[PDB]
Amino acid sequence: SAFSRYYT
Amino acid sequence: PIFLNVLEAIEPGVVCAGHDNNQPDSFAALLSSLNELGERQLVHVVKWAKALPGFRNLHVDDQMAVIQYSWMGLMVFAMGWRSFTNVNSAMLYFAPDLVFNEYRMHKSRMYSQCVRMRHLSQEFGWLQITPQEFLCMKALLLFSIIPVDGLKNQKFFDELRMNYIKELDRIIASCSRRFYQLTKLLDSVQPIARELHQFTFDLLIKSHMVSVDFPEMMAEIISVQVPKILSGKVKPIYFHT
Numbered sequence: 627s628a629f630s631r632y633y634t
Numbered sequence: 635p636i637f638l639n640v641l642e643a644i645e646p647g648v649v650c651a652g653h654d655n656n657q658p659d660s661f662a663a664l665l666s667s668l669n670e671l672g673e674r675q676l677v678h679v680v681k682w683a684k685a686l687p688g689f690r691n692l693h694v695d696d697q698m699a700v701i702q703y704s705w706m707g708l709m710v711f712a713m714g715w716r717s718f719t720n721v722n723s724a725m726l727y728f729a730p731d732l733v734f735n736e737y738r739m740h741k742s743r744m745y746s747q748c749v750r751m752r753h754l755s756q757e758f759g760w761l762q763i764t765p766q767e768f769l770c771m772k773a774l775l776l777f778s779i780i781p782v783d784g785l786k787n788q789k790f791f792d793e794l795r796m797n798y799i800k801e802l803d804r805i806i807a808s809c810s811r812r813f814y815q816l817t818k819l820l821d822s823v824q825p826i827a828r829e830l831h832q833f834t835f836d837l838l839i840k841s842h843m844v845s846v847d848f849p850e851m852m853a854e855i856i857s858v859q860v861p862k863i864l865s866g867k868v869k870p871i872y873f874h875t
Protein backbone atom coordinates (compact mmCIF):
# COMPACT_ATOMS: atom_id res chain seq x y z
CA SER A 627 0.00 0.00 0.00
CA ALA A 628 0.90 3.77 -0.23
CA PHE A 629 0.62 3.73 3.62
CA SER A 630 2.93 0.67 4.28
CA ARG A 631 5.56 1.85 1.78
CA TYR A 632 5.62 5.23 3.43
CA TYR A 633 5.50 3.67 6.93
CA THR A 634 8.34 1.30 6.27
CA PRO B 635 7.24 11.95 34.90
CA ILE B 636 8.98 10.66 31.90
CA PHE B 637 5.69 9.72 30.23
CA LEU B 638 4.27 13.22 30.04
CA ASN B 639 7.64 14.70 29.12
CA VAL B 640 7.48 12.50 26.01
CA LEU B 641 3.90 13.29 25.04
CA GLU B 642 4.57 17.02 25.20
CA ALA B 643 7.90 16.69 23.33
CA ILE B 644 6.38 14.70 20.44
CA GLU B 645 3.16 16.64 20.03
CA PRO B 646 2.79 17.82 16.44
CA GLY B 647 2.80 21.52 15.64
CA VAL B 648 0.66 23.50 13.16
CA VAL B 649 -0.60 21.86 9.97
CA CYS B 650 -2.04 24.08 7.22
CA ALA B 651 -4.64 22.66 4.72
CA GLY B 652 -3.38 24.73 1.72
CA HIS B 653 -6.95 26.05 1.30
CA ASP B 654 -7.50 28.94 -1.16
CA ASN B 655 -9.64 31.23 0.96
CA ASN B 656 -10.24 33.46 -2.13
CA GLN B 657 -12.41 30.97 -3.89
CA PRO B 658 -16.03 30.88 -2.86
CA ASP B 659 -17.06 28.27 -0.35
CA SER B 660 -18.11 25.27 -2.41
CA PHE B 661 -18.76 21.72 -1.32
CA ALA B 662 -16.04 20.59 -3.74
CA ALA B 663 -13.42 23.14 -2.61
CA LEU B 664 -14.14 22.72 1.13
CA LEU B 665 -14.15 18.94 0.86
CA SER B 666 -11.02 18.76 -1.26
CA SER B 667 -9.03 20.98 1.08
CA LEU B 668 -10.24 18.85 4.06
CA ASN B 669 -9.08 15.78 2.23
CA GLU B 670 -5.74 17.38 1.68
CA LEU B 671 -5.58 18.41 5.40
CA GLY B 672 -6.11 14.74 6.15
CA GLU B 673 -3.23 13.44 4.05
CA ARG B 674 -0.85 15.97 5.62
CA GLN B 675 -2.12 15.31 9.12
CA LEU B 676 -1.74 11.60 8.37
CA VAL B 677 2.06 12.13 7.94
CA HIS B 678 2.33 13.84 11.36
CA VAL B 679 0.18 11.22 13.01
CA VAL B 680 2.56 8.60 11.67
CA LYS B 681 5.71 10.31 12.99
CA TRP B 682 4.02 11.12 16.36
CA ALA B 683 2.92 7.52 16.78
CA LYS B 684 6.30 5.94 16.03
CA ALA B 685 7.78 8.17 18.77
CA LEU B 686 5.15 7.15 21.36
CA PRO B 687 6.34 5.23 24.55
CA GLY B 688 6.24 1.41 23.94
CA PHE B 689 4.69 1.77 20.42
CA ARG B 690 7.65 -0.05 18.68
CA ASN B 691 6.69 -2.97 20.92
CA LEU B 692 3.82 -3.77 18.57
CA HIS B 693 4.25 -6.04 15.61
CA VAL B 694 4.83 -3.71 12.62
CA ASP B 695 1.53 -4.64 10.96
CA ASP B 696 -0.31 -3.90 14.23
CA GLN B 697 1.48 -0.54 14.30
CA MET B 698 0.19 0.21 10.91
CA ALA B 699 -3.24 -1.33 11.38
CA VAL B 700 -3.91 0.73 14.57
CA ILE B 701 -2.89 3.95 12.80
CA GLN B 702 -5.07 3.27 9.76
CA TYR B 703 -8.10 2.54 11.99
CA SER B 704 -7.82 5.32 14.54
CA TRP B 705 -6.68 8.42 12.57
CA MET B 706 -10.20 9.79 12.27
CA GLY B 707 -10.89 9.83 16.06
CA LEU B 708 -7.34 11.06 16.71
CA MET B 709 -7.62 13.92 14.32
CA VAL B 710 -11.16 14.85 15.36
CA PHE B 711 -10.10 14.95 19.02
CA ALA B 712 -7.13 17.23 18.30
CA MET B 713 -9.19 19.54 16.15
CA GLY B 714 -11.81 19.74 18.95
CA TRP B 715 -8.92 20.87 21.25
CA ARG B 716 -7.58 23.42 18.74
CA SER B 717 -11.10 24.70 18.26
CA PHE B 718 -11.46 25.02 22.00
CA THR B 719 -8.16 26.69 22.64
CA ASN B 720 -8.14 29.00 19.57
CA VAL B 721 -11.66 30.13 19.01
CA ASN B 722 -13.26 28.91 22.25
CA SER B 723 -15.34 26.35 20.32
CA ALA B 724 -17.31 29.03 18.31
CA MET B 725 -15.84 27.57 15.12
CA LEU B 726 -14.20 24.36 13.98
CA TYR B 727 -10.42 25.09 13.71
CA PHE B 728 -9.44 22.42 11.21
CA ALA B 729 -6.33 24.49 10.42
CA PRO B 730 -5.24 28.13 10.57
CA ASP B 731 -6.16 28.47 6.86
CA LEU B 732 -9.32 26.33 7.21
CA VAL B 733 -11.70 27.54 9.92
CA PHE B 734 -15.39 26.49 9.62
CA ASN B 735 -18.03 28.98 10.46
CA GLU B 736 -21.69 27.93 10.34
CA TYR B 737 -21.95 28.76 6.72
CA ARG B 738 -19.16 26.40 5.92
CA MET B 739 -20.60 23.72 8.21
CA HIS B 740 -23.60 24.04 6.00
CA LYS B 741 -21.77 24.25 2.67
CA SER B 742 -19.76 21.08 3.44
CA ARG B 743 -23.02 19.06 3.64
CA MET B 744 -21.68 17.77 6.95
CA TYR B 745 -23.59 20.07 9.20
CA SER B 746 -24.88 17.54 11.75
CA GLN B 747 -21.45 15.95 11.92
CA CYS B 748 -19.98 19.39 12.45
CA VAL B 749 -22.46 20.08 15.28
CA ARG B 750 -21.24 16.98 17.05
CA MET B 751 -17.58 18.04 16.69
CA ARG B 752 -18.36 21.52 18.01
CA HIS B 753 -20.18 19.80 20.87
CA LEU B 754 -17.03 17.69 21.53
CA SER B 755 -14.97 20.86 21.45
CA GLN B 756 -17.41 22.49 23.84
CA GLU B 757 -16.75 19.63 26.21
CA PHE B 758 -13.10 20.54 26.63
CA GLY B 759 -14.45 23.75 28.13
CA TRP B 760 -17.38 22.36 30.15
CA LEU B 761 -15.09 19.74 31.73
CA GLN B 762 -12.07 22.05 32.28
CA ILE B 763 -9.81 19.46 30.51
CA THR B 764 -6.13 20.26 31.06
CA PRO B 765 -3.39 20.12 28.33
CA GLN B 766 -2.02 17.01 30.06
CA GLU B 767 -5.33 15.21 30.19
CA PHE B 768 -5.83 16.11 26.49
CA LEU B 769 -2.41 14.68 25.59
CA CYS B 770 -2.99 11.46 27.43
CA MET B 771 -6.54 10.99 26.18
CA LYS B 772 -5.31 11.54 22.62
CA ALA B 773 -2.57 8.90 23.00
CA LEU B 774 -5.25 6.40 24.13
CA LEU B 775 -7.47 7.08 21.12
CA LEU B 776 -4.60 5.40 19.06
CA PHE B 777 -5.32 2.20 21.02
CA SER B 778 -9.07 2.50 20.81
CA ILE B 779 -10.05 0.55 17.73
CA ILE B 780 -9.09 -3.05 16.74
CA PRO B 781 -10.27 -5.91 14.56
CA VAL B 782 -12.90 -8.07 16.21
CA ASP B 783 -10.62 -11.05 15.47
CA GLY B 784 -7.73 -9.43 17.30
CA LEU B 785 -4.32 -8.20 16.23
CA LYS B 786 -1.20 -10.00 15.02
CA ASN B 787 0.28 -9.82 18.57
CA GLN B 788 -2.71 -9.13 20.67
CA LYS B 789 -0.79 -9.41 24.05
CA PHE B 790 1.57 -6.49 23.38
CA PHE B 791 -1.39 -4.35 22.32
CA ASP B 792 -3.37 -5.20 25.47
CA GLU B 793 -0.43 -4.35 27.73
CA LEU B 794 0.37 -1.07 25.93
CA ARG B 795 -3.27 0.04 26.04
CA MET B 796 -3.46 -0.90 29.78
CA ASN B 797 -0.37 1.24 30.45
CA TYR B 798 -1.85 4.23 28.68
CA ILE B 799 -5.03 3.90 30.78
CA LYS B 800 -2.82 3.77 33.87
CA GLU B 801 -1.06 6.95 32.77
CA LEU B 802 -4.34 8.79 32.28
CA ASP B 803 -5.53 7.76 35.74
CA ARG B 804 -2.07 8.88 37.07
CA ILE B 805 -2.16 12.36 35.58
CA ILE B 806 -5.66 12.67 37.01
CA ALA B 807 -4.25 11.95 40.53
CA SER B 808 -14.18 12.62 44.02
CA CYS B 809 -11.55 12.10 41.28
CA SER B 810 -13.76 9.13 40.63
CA ARG B 811 -16.35 11.19 38.74
CA ARG B 812 -13.38 12.67 36.76
CA PHE B 813 -12.24 9.41 35.27
CA TYR B 814 -15.92 8.46 34.66
CA GLN B 815 -16.21 11.72 32.84
CA LEU B 816 -12.98 11.53 30.76
CA THR B 817 -13.72 7.91 29.61
CA LYS B 818 -17.19 8.96 28.72
CA LEU B 819 -15.78 11.85 26.61
CA LEU B 820 -13.32 9.39 25.03
CA ASP B 821 -16.27 7.12 24.15
CA SER B 822 -18.15 10.01 22.61
CA VAL B 823 -15.38 10.48 19.99
CA GLN B 824 -16.31 7.06 18.58
CA PRO B 825 -19.82 7.70 17.21
CA ILE B 826 -18.61 10.97 15.62
CA ALA B 827 -15.67 9.16 13.94
CA ARG B 828 -18.17 6.50 12.84
CA GLU B 829 -20.34 9.07 11.10
CA LEU B 830 -17.36 10.65 9.42
CA HIS B 831 -16.23 7.24 8.22
CA GLN B 832 -19.63 6.56 6.75
CA PHE B 833 -19.58 10.09 5.26
CA THR B 834 -16.06 9.99 3.73
CA PHE B 835 -16.59 6.52 2.37
CA ASP B 836 -19.86 7.51 0.59
CA LEU B 837 -18.14 10.63 -0.59
CA LEU B 838 -15.14 8.83 -2.10
CA ILE B 839 -17.42 6.33 -3.86
CA LYS B 840 -19.16 9.19 -5.63
CA SER B 841 -16.31 11.72 -5.67
CA HIS B 842 -15.69 11.71 -9.45
CA MET B 843 -19.34 12.86 -9.90
CA VAL B 844 -18.88 15.73 -7.43
CA SER B 845 -15.32 16.76 -8.40
CA VAL B 846 -13.96 16.10 -4.92
CA ASP B 847 -10.26 15.25 -4.79
CA PHE B 848 -8.95 12.50 -2.53
CA PRO B 849 -5.14 12.35 -2.21
CA GLU B 850 -3.47 9.00 -2.58
CA MET B 851 -3.07 7.58 0.86
CA MET B 852 -6.55 8.90 1.89
CA ALA B 853 -8.07 7.14 -1.14
CA GLU B 854 -6.51 3.83 -0.32
CA ILE B 855 -7.18 3.90 3.41
CA ILE B 856 -10.78 4.94 2.89
CA SER B 857 -11.36 2.16 0.41
CA VAL B 858 -9.31 -0.61 2.09
CA GLN B 859 -9.39 -0.01 5.81
CA VAL B 860 -12.46 2.13 6.47
CA PRO B 861 -14.84 -0.51 5.02
CA LYS B 862 -13.44 -3.10 7.47
CA ILE B 863 -14.88 -0.75 10.17
CA LEU B 864 -18.19 0.00 8.38
CA SER B 865 -18.75 -3.75 7.73
CA GLY B 866 -18.14 -4.50 11.40
CA LYS B 867 -14.81 -6.43 11.14
CA VAL B 868 -13.10 -3.69 13.16
CA LYS B 869 -14.74 -2.03 16.13
CA PRO B 870 -13.95 0.63 18.71
CA ILE B 871 -13.07 -0.21 22.24
CA TYR B 872 -15.62 1.47 24.50
CA PHE B 873 -15.00 2.15 28.10
CA HIS B 874 -18.72 2.19 29.02
CA THR B 875 -21.42 -0.05 27.66
Ligand SMILES: C[C@]12CCC(=O)C[C@@H]1CC[C@@H]1[C@@H]2CC[C@]2(C)[C@@H](O)CC[C@@H]12
Nearest residue numbers: 668669671672675709710713728830834
Ligand atom coordinates in the same frame (compact mmCIF):
# COMPACT_ATOMS: atom_id res chain seq x y z
C1 LIG C 1 -9.80 14.43 9.40
C2 LIG C 1 -10.39 15.78 8.97
C3 LIG C 1 -9.20 16.72 8.74
C4 LIG C 1 -8.25 16.68 9.93
C5 LIG C 1 -9.05 17.34 11.07
O1 LIG C 1 -8.61 18.36 11.62
C6 LIG C 1 -10.41 16.72 11.41
C7 LIG C 1 -11.21 16.46 10.11
C8 LIG C 1 -12.54 15.74 10.37
C9 LIG C 1 -13.33 15.46 9.08
C10 LIG C 1 -12.51 14.74 8.00
C11 LIG C 1 -11.20 15.50 7.68
C12 LIG C 1 -10.39 14.78 6.53
C13 LIG C 1 -11.22 14.63 5.24
C14 LIG C 1 -12.58 13.96 5.52
C15 LIG C 1 -12.38 12.49 5.90
C16 LIG C 1 -13.64 14.11 4.44
O2 LIG C 1 -13.47 13.15 3.41
C17 LIG C 1 -15.00 13.87 5.18
C18 LIG C 1 -14.72 14.00 6.69
C19 LIG C 1 -13.32 14.65 6.70
